[PDB]
């Protein structure tokens, strides 16, 4: 497996935990 | 045809009773549309028949919008937490899905909001990990 490639899949969907940190 | 016809209308009654809630925080007026329908609304998206038709029309947009934050930095109503993360779970969810929509950012947030529910965060937590199988096929 490339885990390198899998993460980059991983941050398409999840993102990076930044997109609502707004909030707090 | 009609399960189109009725997964488009499903959305579009999603999107309208989101917009009008956050149209109503901005105003100061009650924004009660997500509570008053959110059990009727998730026991349609439930619909096995239906599934298929509403993840192909977006559905995740709008299950994503509802799950997001209001326009002043507040939450929605725990029970439109607690249910539409339920909705979420039942549903054949795939990468492509998830990329398109964004919903995993959501759940994402869920699972790590210090002020969420010990409750919620683990199914959120519980969701994040399921679907990070679509990861790894």
Redesign the interface.
């Known amino acids: ?1 490339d885990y390198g490639d ?1 993460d980059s ?2 941050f ?4 990076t ?1 930044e ?2 940190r ?3 | 045809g009609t399960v189109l016809e009725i997964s488009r209308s499903l959305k579009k009654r999603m999107q309208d009773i989101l917009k009008k809630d956050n149209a109503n925080n901005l105003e100061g007026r009650p924004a009660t549309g997500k509570i008053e329908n959110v059990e009727e609304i998730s026991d349609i998206l439930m619909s096995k028949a239906l599934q298929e038709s509403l993840l192909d029309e977006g559905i995740l947009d709008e299950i994503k919008g509802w799950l ?2 209001l326009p002043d ?1 507040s ?1 929605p109503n725990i029970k439109i937490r607690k249910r539409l993360l339920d909705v979420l779970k039942t549903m054949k969810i795939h ?1 492509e899905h ?2 398109t929509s ?1 919903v ?3 759940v ?2 869920y699972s ?4 969420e529910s010990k409750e919620v965060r683990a199914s959120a937590k519980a969701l ?1 990990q399921k ?2 199988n ?3 096929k």
């Open positions: 497996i899998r899949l991983f398409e969907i999840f993102g935990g997109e609502y707004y909030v707090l | 997001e934050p930095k939450m990468k998830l990329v964004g995993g950012k959501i994402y947030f790590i909001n210090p002020k994040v679907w990070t679509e990861v790894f």
